[PDB]
């Protein structure tokens, strides 16, 4: 069984790119 552990970091640190290297917030 595999969830949350796939779900709280590949999806909740992995998208750290998707979201500030869009907007950019900073960048």
């Known amino acids: 069984k595999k969830l949350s552990i796939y779900e ?4 909740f640190g992995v998208l750290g790119a998707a979201l500030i290297g869009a907007i950019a917030p900073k960048k």
């Not at 709280?8 to 999806?11: F, G, I, P, Q």
């Open 8 to 11: 709280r970091v590949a999806l």
